[PDB]
Ligand binder design. Structure first.
Ligand code: HEC
Length: 80
């Protein structure tokens, strides 16, 4: 699913079935994404850039921001 092909390689290895392999308390569930407030496409492009501890990072070396706005979508076809 375009963005899925990317998320299923640069995320799949940590975000298996909208799950987590590091933190079993921080899922992609809106219920949670709401508390922190992460229910947007952009948000799912910037942070990824320079996110906090626990999660790696993704510069414009491999995946360009413009290509990130495409990923944010993948996270809007299951649990916006
Ligand atoms: C393990 C090496 C990870 C990879 C690869 C990716 N993410 Fe991640 N993600 C990870 C953790 C441990 C957490 C919990 C938050 C923390 O305190 O670290 C998360 C959380 C998210 C969330 C939910 C909250 C948020 O900050 O957005 C989202 C939406 C998210 N992660 C997105 C995401 C994407 C799009 C990734 C591939 C580009 C990706 N993550 C990789 C661990 C890991």
């Amino acid at each position: 699913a375009g963005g899925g092909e990317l998320f299923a390689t640069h995320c799949a290895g940590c975000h298996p079935q909208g799950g987590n392999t590091v933190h079993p308390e921080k899922t992609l569930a809106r219920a949670r994404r709401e508390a922190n407030g992460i229910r947007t496409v952009r948000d799912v492009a910037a942070y990824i850039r320079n996110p906090g501890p626990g999660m790696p990072a993704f510069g414009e070396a491999m995946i360009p921001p413009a290509d990130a706005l495409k990923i944010g979508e993948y996270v809007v076809a299951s649990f916006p």
